[PDB]
Amino acid sequence: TTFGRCAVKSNQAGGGTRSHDWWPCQLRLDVLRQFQPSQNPLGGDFDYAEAFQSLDYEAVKKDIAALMTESQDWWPADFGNYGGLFVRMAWHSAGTYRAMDGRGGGGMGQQRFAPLNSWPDNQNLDKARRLIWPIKQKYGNKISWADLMLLTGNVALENMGFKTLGFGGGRADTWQSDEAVYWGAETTFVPQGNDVRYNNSVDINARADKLEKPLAATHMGLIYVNPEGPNGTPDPAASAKDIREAFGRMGMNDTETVALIAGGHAFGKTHGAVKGSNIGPAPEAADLGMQGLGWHNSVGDGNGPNQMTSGLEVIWTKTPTKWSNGYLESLINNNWTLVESPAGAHQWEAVNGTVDYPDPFDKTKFRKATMLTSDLALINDPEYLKISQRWLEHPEELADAFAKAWFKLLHRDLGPTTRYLGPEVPKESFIWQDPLPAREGDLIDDADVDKLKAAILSTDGLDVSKLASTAMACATTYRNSDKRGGCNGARIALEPQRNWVSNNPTQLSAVLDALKKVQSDFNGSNGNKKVSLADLIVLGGTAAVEKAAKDAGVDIKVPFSAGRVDATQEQTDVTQFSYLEPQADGFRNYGRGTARARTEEIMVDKASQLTLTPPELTVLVGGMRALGANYDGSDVGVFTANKGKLTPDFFVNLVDMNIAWTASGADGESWVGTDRKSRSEKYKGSRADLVFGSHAELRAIAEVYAENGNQEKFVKDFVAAWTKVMNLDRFDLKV
Amino acid sequence: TTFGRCAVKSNQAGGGTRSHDWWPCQLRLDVLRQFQPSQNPLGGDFDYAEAFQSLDYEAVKKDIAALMTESQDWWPADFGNYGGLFVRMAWHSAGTYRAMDGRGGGGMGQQRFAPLNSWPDNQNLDKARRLIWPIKQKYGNKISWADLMLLTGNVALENMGFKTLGFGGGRADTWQSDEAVYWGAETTFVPQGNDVRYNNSVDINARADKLEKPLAATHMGLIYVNPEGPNGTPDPAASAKDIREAFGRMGMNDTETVALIAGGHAFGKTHGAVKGSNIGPAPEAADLGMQGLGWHNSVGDGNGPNQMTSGLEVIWTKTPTKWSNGYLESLINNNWTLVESPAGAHQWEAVNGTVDYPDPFDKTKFRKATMLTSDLALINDPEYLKISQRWLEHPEELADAFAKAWFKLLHRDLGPTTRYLGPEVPKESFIWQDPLPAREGDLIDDADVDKLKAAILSTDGLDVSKLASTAMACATTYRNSDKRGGCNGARIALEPQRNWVSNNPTQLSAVLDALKKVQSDFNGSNGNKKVSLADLIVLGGTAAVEKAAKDAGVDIKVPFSAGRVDATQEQTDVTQFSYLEPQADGFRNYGRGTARARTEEIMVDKASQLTLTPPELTVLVGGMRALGANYDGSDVGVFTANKGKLTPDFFVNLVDMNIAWTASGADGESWVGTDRKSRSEKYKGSRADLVFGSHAELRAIAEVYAENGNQEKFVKDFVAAWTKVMNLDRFDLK
Ligand code: HEM
């Protein structure tokens, strides 16, 4: 078979040519159908946080520590200690994170599913996960796989003599492969897997800063970089440039990068004992006897001294089970020669070095010092060299930076600190956690909420359209992958969001100033009760939705949950927040897509990050149009003569056959609706508008809301979806 | 570019290389994740039957009838009447049904989604669905698209002079493409789309009866056969062989087949006015301006006299808006010559015939008679000719056969008669409805249930394992695609099921005889109360599950719903039921895979037909193993020392790393589990067993049930899944 095709064509269980085969360019809704409660064996009403709070956390860590030195005959431990392997397992779990889109990381425990379970860089971590299973079996639902993989690495470091800052749990497991992540477009893995992401450039120094966005690895199938140098060329200088690019795409700076690599490579070793032709299929391609494992090695028992993982055979320190400064000392104080491992791969050896690096299965036999090309990178770049030279003589500074970087790596996608669970959460707050202050004052009650809604709606310069638009602009910065963004913090009032062109800065300024007058009037006239700007932004949109429903003939309660706080600019990092800036926004008819992602594809991707189903996406868009909630107040998509009233007029008018739609410019972004009988232009629409009348599955939902009869249902469903979106980041509240 | 690949590679919304790309042979669970309640815009709570029964049904029909003659300028009506178009719409919705697997048909309204919305043979039915949308708009949730597409064809026949038997509603809408159906493996549509289904044979006579199972169309993208003959060869005799094969695979016999074709082709016309180069992309490939329509025709306004659908230009009768015998009269009385339509397709013309066939847009202009190659088939086969000859002389017989066959076409995937809604459900019971009687005596209550459970669990020949096995064997015949099978009717006790090898006939006979003893003891000694064998089979299994739970240390009420009836053998056609016989049954460790599908694939397919989610499939298999419920009573997969007790031992032992699993048979079906320490063989497993420890998503669920502390959860989840499966056919309780 060619790529993506099985040689046997199944006739069961979804076998056969499928719609995506015939029409591969059509928009797919798959990413809005993942992670559904039916699919979760634990039930939709399972509360991980509540289960983890009953965990005997201390006993978990004790049992992990014990397991580190209990070698299992099916995968013997190097030096009698799985620590190194476990550190690698946790670092690869967390290490797929990309800062730009916030995807990857360890927070969904996705290493245990395709494709990550079978990436080349994850070779033999199937064995690592299997070794820790008995811990999961003992503790059951009270620790997730997601938390356990990372806790295991953290405990491993501590038991090998490196004290970490602490740990937070809170990562609920997921139950299917996350097929929403764009890992690249290549049709091959490392050693290939990177023509597309370099746009066919092969000049390894020149291309290193030209890696396709948002990717954070130099080949499909790798965590960050190729350990044998760029495209396998053993040039440490050029490897350094790759490392900078890749780690930068993961949200790490130079200090963090050197700390992580020199910290991690204090421990363990690589494996490259036998040629790769001896290694069987990865877990997703292996036979049923492998029972979820892969890479079966036919030499010997395939393990112990015959272990083959990367094809390199490097032991960095003389004490691979104990924290030390041996990595930097070897790196800088040895002379390096290029040699081949037993499997044939490029590495470096100190061929006149001391013969005192221990063998992993013989306590009396030794070898010379070795390094990877990607380790030599750290003394073949001026910035990395300065850091390496400083830490060579000041290892406490390495230790400090490593502790902080390791914490950040494990917890980058955990979200706000209100998500962090367990008895050793670090007390220090860090900028990457998007910190929030404690609240000013006592919490407003329902009577205060009712008075503030009336005050907001009677304030000059505030109307239903602007209020709803502003609240949604603030809310849709949320992304579920790394739990960043949302309305808490009022970060729309801060840089960079206050200047995002998609927020219409001049309008936003006037809206916020009017909310700050409501705030000033309330605060100080209600005793100890005080209201934040964050709550007023959300309450103003809430009030607008309620009023728009009443003005459509429907009296409905629009729920509001008080208690958001206002971030400071010092808690709001410009670079980090720039990554949340939309290039197109279908809720507010802003912007457009590009060749490789169309306007409506961006919208569906955004909806996946908001955890919206297809019906919730569809009701929100149509309600936002009815509300006149475009970012600049345009009439594009505003297919209603009742603007500000919460009706399904967008749907009704979109599917009216007396309107004919035609393209207005060259790029397919703008569309005109013409009345067929009168020949007069009636409407202007965008792709975000018209996809709901074109995609067969979305149109089926559009038709529900356009049905004579479902008018009350439209309001009910809009209000439910609004409430969901406003509350996504409310981890401070429970249930 | 490459088949199945977009030239532009999106980086959003699921764009990028995907796990199914890297490992295309791996088992996929997608078919267990369809039709989820969160996807349904109506809500999970929505009850279609209740909505329909409040529908002003007569008014719907009245509005359809009026629409028929309300020509719309964007798709003008041939002869001023949309009736033929609407009949075609209905017939194509219902016409994808395959009897053998029970898939396709109109019962899910799938014509409105990919791929059916864009099949060649459904060209311009996008316009037909759009013309009826104002009816759907007016009546809302109270009539589904699925019901409305078929009702519209029904009403069209009645408003063109053809009285049907009646109609039943009840088809709830679905909300995504059904990607579980095997339509074929070809990577092209008609005019190609058939190398795989004929195994590369191009010998049109010899291959006709060799069409790949369970397919029911001669090319990918067609409803039944090619109207231009086999592979476009204009040979009516060969076309007849394809028709018999395809219609046979749809459950229709020779009389049904002629009745459907000659009945349908009373009405309307084909469209072939301009060449195919003038036609734009199908709906799934069309630009946003098309707003779900496709096949834009660039000649004139693309419509009216320029309509292009199939490429053929045939008008069968002189009165295309009114029922007549003109189809058979023309077919038999004319001399036919092969000609080209304006689009270049070949068709047949009576070149010396009368010039009295009406033009669809000009009341002063006329043409000669025409027919398709597939129409001439009916007088170029001995059995079809005999039928055509008889009905030429006795057209009432065609009308009676067409009424009956049309009713069967539209309703056979609707399920049991208890699902049929509305005021004109035909009174005649038909064998293809798998009919069921009304109940005997008064309904058992919970006191009677308690007495019966205690008797069943202490009767000669019965035990936990046997009862659980027997109840699951009867239940897993259910298939949601056409709502056939299940436990209602006690058809496991009838032919052919009572002699299926998968049911272990000698053990089944001893189980059934024991349950019939319990029945006989209860019936007649409880006044007018009577209990059915069907209730006893399910009650027995349910009681067994409850006891097995108790013995595992969990006290749980296992709910039982009484009221099933016993079917008679007269109501149980043996050929019809042969289509429910499983190739493999993973719940009971029966069977093996084929050259096309592995054992575990068949299991996931079955689970999809049961509407199971991946946790429900997993829990059931592991519980059935704990129960010792294999079809043959073997120890394969029975990884427990406590057989008959509802523990999660299957999972615990499957994931024990002290066991190494290796292949035993050449065929990949058998596996041995060896203790790594002692080197002793401990277990035998199947593929249905071991897949739960291999597939990463299934294994994640197996792990949950293997975890300390989850023994109660295992029982709870097993009981919920058991209850769901036992009750799948209980449409009488709705
Ligand atoms: C430029 C970045 C890095 C590269 C290219 C790299 C490459 C590698 C390779 C090739 C192996 C050997 C796998 C095998 O054959 O078993 C490995 C092992 C390992 N790496 Fe890294 N690494 C990087 C960063 C990290 C970081 C950031 C950490 C953790 C903080 C880490 C911790 C480890 C550990 C502990 C092992 C030893 C595993 C064992 O003993 O089995 N590395 N690394």
Ligand code: HEM
């Ligand atoms: C051997 C089986 C059959 C074949 C090959 C076949 C073929 C076709 C073709 C090629 C068209 C023309 C589509 C177009 O160009 O507009 C058509 C139209 C039509 N068919 Fe059939 N047909 C079959 C069976 C049936 C059946 C079973 C029915 C209904 C009971 C039916 C009812 C209709 C009607 C009413 C039209 C006219 C549509 C209009 O007026 O727009 N056909 N058929």
